[PDB]
């Protein structure tokens with residue numbers, strides 16, 4: 619009925635201009651933000667939520683030089699942060715995983731997807747379709763021959779693991795509502811809100827369709843009012859200071 623353990627796994631970092639976490643701010647200060655993956659230990663097996671950054675980001679802060687985000691996004695990734703290495707240190711190989719869940723196919727969430735060539739990768743149809751043509755998607759995040767499990771809308775992965783369709787930040791973004799043995803209800807917003815203030819205070823942040831993103835935040839607030847979960851945001855430096863991280867779990 620519940621997930622046995624929910625692990626927060628640091629998967630490197632990325633510098634992002636602060637105007638991407640609060641659209642009102644003047645550009646020109648970068649923030650060193652966490653990149654997360656999550657590992658769910660379930661009765662049916664281990665499930666990995668997101669896959670970190672692509673190998674091209676390893677020791678390559680200048681990855682986005684020459685692109686429309688030059689100077690605004692700089693990966694902070696070492697060899698240790700490649701998802702296969704993270705998993706091996708934790709105690710898994712890619713073919714051990716039951717599912718991969720892609721919140722969305724942005725570069726720091728699906729950069730590791732190519733490592734999983736057998737495991738089904740659960741991703742929203744609207745996200746998959748966007749990734750095929752929109753400029754903000756890297757080739758590494760939309761590789762053609764992976765075992766995609768394309769879904770549409772809300773979806774129950776296994777008992778205790780619910781996906782909530784939360785488009786706006788990206789065209790097919792999805793968040794997770796998890797029931798854990800130790801903590802009960804947990805909401806992982808992922809990038810439906812980078813920070814607590816994006817969520818609680820509806821502070822605008824980077825997104826494909828900010829209006830739609832706000833509607834998804836409103837939807838999540840309805841879920842929160844009903845379920846009273848503990849809530850974790852996508853790239854929140856303040857919250858990171860108090861997060862239990864691997865080998866601790868919730």
Ligand SMILES: CCCCCCCCCC(=O)N[C@@H](CCO)C(=O)O
Nearest residue numbers: 632634685691724725726754755756
């Ligand atoms: C030109 C190749 C792709 C350029 C990537 C554009 C960035 C799109 C927005 C994005 O992926 N933001 C990241 C946060 C900062 O790394 C995210 O959604 O987590």
Ligand SMILES: [Zn+2]
Nearest residue numbers: 722724787809
């Ligand atoms: Zn994103």
Ligand SMILES: [Zn+2]
Nearest residue numbers: 726809852853
């Ligand atoms: Zn993100």
